[PDB]
């Protein structure tokens, strides 16, 4: 449960400083690669935190929350004040439906900021099961919000919290406030996309996701998230096209194949479903390049 399942035959076990190789693969809009690189820095230098953080932060973007949490926990193990790790933790547990671990992470994100640590003096009606923890850091983030009316990362955090309680009404208001401020943050355009999609407006969502891919043309979550909206609107041709681009860009892959298996299913292609068990995205022709 503790350590990372490192991928064997890592070509960066042979490269002198691979941190820099990866950091610019992330610059080259190529997550699958940049994850391998950082996987080496973590194996070569266990004690270096910006390696575990870049690793986690990247795996989350590469649609693998599993490995992302394992990685961020080691980055946190090394520096428990690291607001970017905690920000990311909250997002990942929210996605993974681990509520208590999410609230804890948001709270920790806030209280680690020196400009808010003044708030550590703390003390039926509104939603959540896991209730004291949620009433707390909802208060805490509003107090933070009436200190600094236009902190984008404060809205984005409220957005995260309101997704956990299934209030995509308020989540979308805040995450809309958060982009606008920072209209070129891909992380933030996706968050809007997902909030909207979860709150049953996939139409709008698809807009929000396109702005994200305009900024980071190789962001694998999002490609996946676009499949999820197209699937929810029962436009399965489109979902299918989008998932393939997402599977391709992911590199083996995941339960990503399980999702593709149920599309081809409802689509009435017993063939194709039969040959998903080969690694190969190769045969699946509607896109080329």
């Amino acid at each position: 449960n503790t350590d990372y399942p490192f991928e064997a035959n890592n070509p960066y076990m042979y490269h002198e400083n691979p941190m820099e190789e990866g950091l610019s693969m992330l610059k080259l809009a190529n997550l699958a690669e940049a994850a391998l690189a950082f996987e080496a820095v973590c194996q070569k230098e266990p004690e270096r935190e910006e390696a575990w953080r870049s690793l986690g932060l990247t795996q989350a973007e590469n649609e693998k929350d599993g490995l992302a949490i394992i990685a961020l926990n080691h980055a946190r193990a090394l520096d428990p004040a690291d607001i970017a790790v905690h920000a990311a933790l909250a997002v990942s547990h929210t996605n993974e439906h681990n509520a208590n671990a999410a609230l804890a992470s948001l709270r920790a994100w806030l209280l680690s900021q020196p400009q808010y640590e003044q708030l550590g003096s703390v003390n039926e009606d509104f939603f959540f099961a896991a209730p004291n923890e949620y009433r707390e850091c909802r208060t805490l983030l509003h107090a933070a919000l009436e200190m600094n009316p236009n902190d984008a990362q404060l809205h984005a955090s409220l957005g995260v919290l309101y997704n956990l309680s299934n209030n995509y009404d308020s989540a979308a208001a805040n995450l809309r406030r958060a982009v606008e401020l920072r209209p070129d943050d891909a992380q933030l355009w996706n968050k809007l996309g997902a909030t909207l999609a979860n709150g049953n407006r996939p139409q709008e969502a698809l807009d929000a996701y396109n702005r994200a891919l305009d900024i980071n043309p190789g962001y694998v979550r999002v490609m996946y998230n676009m499949a999820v909206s197209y699937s929810n609107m029962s436009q399965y041709d489109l979902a299918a096209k989008q998932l393939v681009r997402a599977i391709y860009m992911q590199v083996a892959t995941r339960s990503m194949w399980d999702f593709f298996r149920m599309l081809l299913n409802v689509m009435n292609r017993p063939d194709l479903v039969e040959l998903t068990y080969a690694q190969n995205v190769e045969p699946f022709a509607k896109e080329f390049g």
């Binding site: 997002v91 929210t94 996706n190 909030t195 969502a205 979550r221 996946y224 999820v228 609107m233």
Partner: peptide, 7 residues
């Protein structure tokens, strides 16, 4: 329509 989107 019932699948979950990711933040």
């Amino acid at each position: 329509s019932n699948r979950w989107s990711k933040l």
